[PDB]
């Protein structure tokens, strides 16, 4: 009655039989923008079925010497589905999310992942220059659906240590206990509406802390799939398409 769960959003549903729990980020639910906090004077669009559903990204194979991964939200969904078409025709944007990272392994495998959610996750450059200076490319800061591997996961590629990164909303995927992590995140920004193309709010991060080990003869290919879903999404400022 606690290890079994089902999450139906839109026309899609996720079952699980070996879950742990569900984490609300900072104790709050994603909701629509109230009238006392809105600053635009147009009426927003709210599709509410066509954009609030579970989108499944690609799978990441987890190996012995993986140094870890990061996506940007809502960067990964600007080109998939009707959420990718409403986020290009409209200047303004507001949503929550509901994340789910699946990774199964047998009773003879061991290891652990750290699935956390970092608001305003800024990538650092990797040079000893005091001004010129190195800055990350656009496919490194805004990677898309294929993510990006960390170079230095010990400092999260931002000069900030992983050992204190449990202050963010997070779960663990311990292969002897569970196989999935679920984090529900509200809209966290200093402005009520903001653009979905320039500004990615937060970044999902999956880093294997204890490495994958298995005895000989076991299944060598352990993939990590990620299924995300917008919640309470609304757009504004209709114009022509800009990607």
């Amino acid at each position: 009655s606690d290890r079994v769960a089902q999450l139906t959003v839109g026309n899609s549903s996720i079952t699980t039989q070996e879950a742990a729990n569900i984490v609300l980020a900072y104790g709050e639910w994603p909701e629509y923008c109230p009238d006392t906090d809105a600053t635009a004077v147009d009426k927003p669009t709210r599709p509410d079925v066509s954009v609030n559903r579970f989108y499944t990204l690609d799978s990441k194979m987890w190996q012995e010497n993986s140094t870890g991964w990061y996506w940007k939200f809502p960067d990964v969904l600007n080109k998939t589905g009707v959420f990718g078409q409403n986020a290009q025709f409209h200047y303004l944007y507001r949503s929550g999310f509901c994340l789910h990272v699946q990774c199964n392994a047998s009773k003879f495998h061991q290891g652990a992942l750290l699935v956390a959610v970092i608001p305003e996750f800024v990538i650092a450059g990797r040079g000893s220059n005091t001004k010129e200076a190195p800055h990350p490319g656009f496919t490194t800061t805004f990677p898309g659906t294929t993510g990006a591997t960390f170079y230095d996961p010990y400092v999260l590629d931002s000069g900030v240590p992983l050992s204190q990164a449990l202050i963010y909303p997070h779960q663990w995927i311990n292969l002897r206990t569970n196989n999935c992590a679920t984090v529900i995140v509200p809209y966290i920004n200093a402005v009520p509406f903001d653009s979905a193309i320039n500004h990615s709010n937060f970044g999902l991060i999956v880093i294997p802390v204890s490495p994958l080990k298995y005895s000989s003869g076991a299944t060598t290919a352990i993939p990590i799939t990620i299924t995300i879903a917008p919640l309470n999404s609304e757009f504004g400022g209709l114009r022509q398409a800009v990607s």
């Binding site: 996750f121 000893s128 220059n129 400092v155 900030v160 800009v242």
Partner: protein, 284 residues
């Protein structure tokens, strides 16, 4: 009668806490089924095992203070944010107001993502040999868009609209209060995004992380005189954060700092968070 489906809370709870928590007396547990020592860290929650359920405790009426640890008493301590060098003989000096250049107050402010505060500046101006020479100074505040002064005796120093402070070197240091001047609803120290649209490059994009909601203007200073006096000056600007609210905590910096606006580090020399010891099986 019409289409039907057109018709179709939180967790935390704040408590006013004055002193630290007490301790109630305990006893011994000899029973099965009820276990407070077993946790599950995979659920994303911390352990809730109190010390009354691990050992046998006594009754302690605790009277310690939890007052100095709040975010108002932690940030209302003024520290250095900028040093303006003025050598007279172009005759003036400017300073783009950016407090991310000095490292004592930067690392305290990088614990959080969004902060909403008022400030209280103080300008301690001395000479290069110690100070105290009776000359008169002018400190303008130039908002973004206002014309910066282009000369020692230019017309932008008439100062009919924007604020300015006249004070001698031999007076007590000048001190003002500054409101929340951002167009957003919070100063954000980490902006994962780009300011403008367009094709962003791969080699060197110097605009990644630039948050224009934080750029607050330019601070100009001259010596109020006609003939160029010949004396080298330094001002020191001290900011005190007051009436401060903070959101979304984040981990504290562990790597040594590099640039003002960018959170760079070198990957060839990554300093470990814990200093080394001999082995794992001994404590000293």
């Amino acid at each position: 009668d019409p289409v039907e489906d057109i018709i179709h809370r939180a967790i935390s709870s704040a408590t006013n806490v004055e002193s630290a928590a007490n301790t109630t007396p305990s006893s011994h547990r000899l029973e099965t089924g009820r276990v407070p020592a077993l946790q599950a860290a995979e659920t994303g929650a911390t352990s809730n095992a109190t010390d009354e359920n691990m050992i046998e405790t006594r009754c302690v009426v605790n009277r310690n203070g939890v007052l100095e640890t709040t975010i108002n008493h932690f940030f209302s301590r003024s520290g250095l944010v900028g040093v303006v060098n003025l050598t007279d003989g172009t005759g003036y000096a400017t300073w783009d107001i950016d407090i991310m250049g000095f490292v004592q107050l930067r690392r305290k402010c990088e614990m959080f993502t969004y902060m909403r505060f008022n400030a209280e500046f103080t300008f301690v101006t001395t000479t290069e040999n110690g100070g105290a020479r009776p000359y008169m100074l002018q400190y303008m505040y130039v908002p973004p868009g206002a014309p910066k002064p282009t000369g020692r005796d230019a017309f932008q120093w008439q100062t009919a609209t924007n604020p300015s402070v006249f004070v001698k070197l031999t007076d007590p240091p000048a001190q003002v209060s500054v409101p929340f001047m951002s167009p957003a609803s919070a100063y954000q120290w980490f902006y994962d995004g780009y300011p403008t649209f367009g094709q962003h490059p791969e080699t060197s994009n110097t605009t990644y992380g630039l948050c224009p909601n934080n750029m607050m203007g330019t601070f100009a200073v001259r010596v109020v005189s006609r003939e160029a006096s010949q004396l080298k000056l330094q001002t020191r600007v001290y900011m005190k954060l007051k009436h401060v609210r903070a959101w979304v905590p984040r981990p504290i910096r562990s790597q040594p700092y590099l640039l003002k606006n960018f959170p760079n580090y070198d990957s060839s020399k990554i300093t470990n968070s814990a200093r080394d010891r001999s082995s794992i099986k001994q404590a000293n």
